Design a protein around this ligand. Structure first.
Ligand SMILES: CS(=O)(=O)N1CCc2c(c(-c3ccc(Cl)c(C#Cc4cccc(CNCc5ccccc5)c4)c3)nn2CCCN2CCOCC2)C1
Length: 221
């Protein structure tokens, strides 16, 4: 039924790794990354979407607090309600809270719907990654080992299933008997493997990778 390995970068569905800096905007980068892939699949164009638009505009009404944190689910609902999100090129990332400056002239995507997956189900997450595209997730990143990660399949014995950092699952695989999730972070290219981390998969929802998964869709019409 499902492929043993997936890597959506190979289909040209994933934009360059971004750098969040001192603004706690991982939630926004995680949401735009998932939508960028659906935009590519639908239109054939790969376009970075504006994380800053989410930080500045998907705020208290959506239970978000910009650089202090937020949620991918309500970021998607903002895009739905707003009938768009701007390109990153038109509305670039400044790592600061700003006045909402959404301009529909520069709309680069819409969102038709989003779907939340069941907590802790790594099987369901695997299916969504294979059959839908990259999936927005949270992870527990409050361990020095995460910040210091350079390469390999990451396993942190003190990790919890409680999440605090948004990332994007762009694939999965197995390196000689160690299964992993292929994860895009937003701490620049100097983090991990060119901005990516391979995180232990089917090890009991390691670091809460499958705790709160969601993905958007852009439908024909
Ligand atoms: C602990 S937990 O794991 O048990 N869990 C408690 C329940 C929970 C968590 C996450 C979640 C999923 C994915 C991510 Cl990436 C994050 C995150 C994060 C993050 C990223 C950067 C910075 C901070 C710092 N935080 C401060 C803050 C204050 C105010 C708002 C936001 C952030 C947090 C959280 N989803 N759900 C369920 C949805 C809750 N609802 C969201 C609203 O309306 C609809 C319902 C966390």
């Amino acid at each position: 039924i499902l492929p043993d390995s997936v890597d959506w970068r190979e289909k040209g569905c994933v934009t360059e790794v971004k750098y969040q800096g001192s603004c706690g905007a991982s939630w926004a980068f995680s949401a735009v990354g998932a939508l960028e892939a659906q935009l590519k699949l639908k239109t054939g164009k790969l376009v970075s979407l504006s994380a800053q638009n989410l930080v500045d505009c998907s705020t208290e009404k959506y239970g978000n607090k910009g650089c202090n944190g937020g949620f991918m689910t309500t970021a998607f609902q903002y895009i739905i309600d707003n009938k768009g999100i701007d390109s990153d090129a038109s509305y670039p990332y400044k790592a600061m809270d700003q006045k909402c400056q959404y301009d529909s002239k520069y709309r680069a995507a819409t969102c038709s719907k989003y779907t939340e997956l069941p907590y802790g189900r790594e099987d369901v997450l695997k299916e969504a990654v294979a059959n839908k595209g990259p999936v927005s997730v949270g992870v527990d990143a409050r361990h020095p080992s995460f910040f210091l990660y350079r390469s390999g399949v990451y396993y942190e014995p003190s990790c919890t299933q409680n999440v605090n950092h948004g990332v994007l699952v762009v694939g999965y695989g197995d390196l000689n008997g160690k299964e992993y999730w292929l994860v895009k972070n937003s701490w620049g290219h100097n983090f991990g493997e060119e901005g990516y981390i391979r995180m232990a998969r089917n090890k009991g929802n390691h670091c809460g990778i499958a705790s709160f998964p969601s993905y958007p869709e852009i439908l024909q019409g």
